[PDB]
Design a protein around this ligand. Structure first.
Ligand SMILES: [Zn+2]
Length: 400
């Protein structure tokens, strides 16, 4: 398969070069109807890139044509860079969907002395989820001199000591001039190698979006777009989707798991017979398009019959409140969770409000507006509506 093999999080300030860097890595320069493919629960977006190596000069790039000597490059591996719009979305994405990230590029601006507040929280998130395949991009070096750059480097070494990023390379780069980009691309090969996944484990895909692709009004079944986080999917496979389709029973709303079959798979921009973890995967099914239309199945989980995580109507969560540094004066003093609060919960690609119905030692009980499919031990991002916006205040671990 030629599909992406790893998802690499672009962890950095909404403009310390991230955008210019991501594009420098993907080779995208045309102004991007890919924004219509972005997640709507967690706002995760995918941008694939093919890592290649020049046979002539041996340097790495993401272009079919070596940028340094002009010779034809050879294919090495396809990868996918993931991002979210803004700090809050990125943080929520990391806490709720760590399984969607295989490594990360932490962007730190050389232009700035001490670690920016958001950068501190970024490393805090990576620490929490245990993501250690990290690369540090010290961007914007063409703006500072030989001295302030070296000073910033020292600061970064101090900043990462004792953290999941302690052994990360620090690559001075100029995404604008393209300097050291080859060093960064090679670092992606060396520090974010494709993990040794057991392709035989029970398959599991987290659905990001669901559509009805049948031309505006052969009719094709409903389509689900998502990330395979375990095992593999194959055309012809029988799959079950949870929680499933909603229905009313005695003035109440319930969901029924539904089974269907895989008619097609799309990954890396082509139809394939088998798909794996890495990048976005489009699953064509035999499902009634009315059941997937308008993202009806976003947040659902896909697997083989009888081999999916359980469905929960309520959760008991071991709560860990964040010690944030980003926000207004007292926005930083996270007040304790009280009974009757309605919190926003993100787990995997699933999103639902939750009513706190009970309290325990560093624990809360929440009744969910919408059931979620998840395993005991899974991490859930917890947000509180302050003023009128949702702000991340912590995370919970699903208890049995
Ligand atoms: Zn070359």
């Amino acid at each position: 398969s030629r599909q992406a093999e790893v998802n690499i999080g672009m962890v950095g300030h909404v403009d310390h070069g991230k955008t210019t860097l991501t594009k420098a890595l993907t080779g995208v320069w045309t102004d991007h109807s890919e924004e219509l493919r972005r997640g709507i629960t967690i706002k995760i977006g995918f941008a694939d890139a093919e890592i290649r190596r020049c046979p002539n000069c041996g340097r790495y790039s993401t272009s079919p044509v070596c940028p340094y000597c002009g010779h034809e490059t050879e294919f090495v591996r396809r990868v996918s860079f993931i991002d979210a719009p803004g700090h809050e979305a990125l943080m929520t994405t990391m806490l709720a969907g760590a399984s969607l990230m295989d490594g990360a590029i932490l962007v730190i601006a050389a232009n700035e002395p001490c670690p920016r507040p958001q950068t501190r929280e970024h490393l805090m998130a990576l620490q929490i989820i245990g993501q250690k395949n990290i690369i540090i991009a010290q961007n914007k070096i063409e703006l500072v001199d030989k001295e302030k750059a070296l000073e910033n480097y020292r600061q970064i070494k101090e900043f990462i000591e004792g953290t999941v990023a302690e052994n990360a390379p620090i690559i001075p780069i100029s995404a604008l001039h393209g300097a050291n980009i080859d060093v960064l691309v090679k670092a992606i090969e060396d520090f974010i190698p494709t993990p040794k996944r057991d392709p035989n484990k029970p398959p599991k895909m987290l659905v990001l979006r669901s559509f009805d692709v049948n031309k505006p009004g052969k009719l094709v079944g409903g389509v689900l777009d998502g990330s395979i986080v375990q095992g593999k999917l194959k055309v012809g496979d029988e799959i079950e989707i949870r929680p499933g389709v909603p229905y009313e029973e005695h003035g109440r709303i319930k969901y029924e798991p539904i089974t269907t079959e895989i008619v097609s798979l799309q990954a890396g921009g082509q139809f394939v017979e088998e798909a794996y973890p890495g990048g976005l995967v489009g699953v064509g099914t035999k499902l009634d398009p009315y059941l997937t239309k308008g993202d009806l199945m976003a947040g659902n989980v896909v697997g083989k019959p009888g081999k999916l995580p359980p469905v929960w109507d309520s959760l008991r969560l071991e709560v860990h409140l964040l010690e944030r540094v980003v926000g207004t004066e007292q926005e930083l003093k996270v007040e304790p969770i009280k009974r009757k609060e309605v919190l926003l919960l993100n787990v995997g690609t699933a999103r639902t409000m939750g009513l706190v119905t009970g309290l325990g030692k560093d624990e809360i009980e929440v009744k969910l507006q919408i059931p979620v499919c998840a395993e005991p031990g899974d991490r859930v991002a917890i947000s509180r509506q302050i003023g009128s916006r949702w702000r991340l205040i912590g995370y919970g671990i699903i208890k049995e």
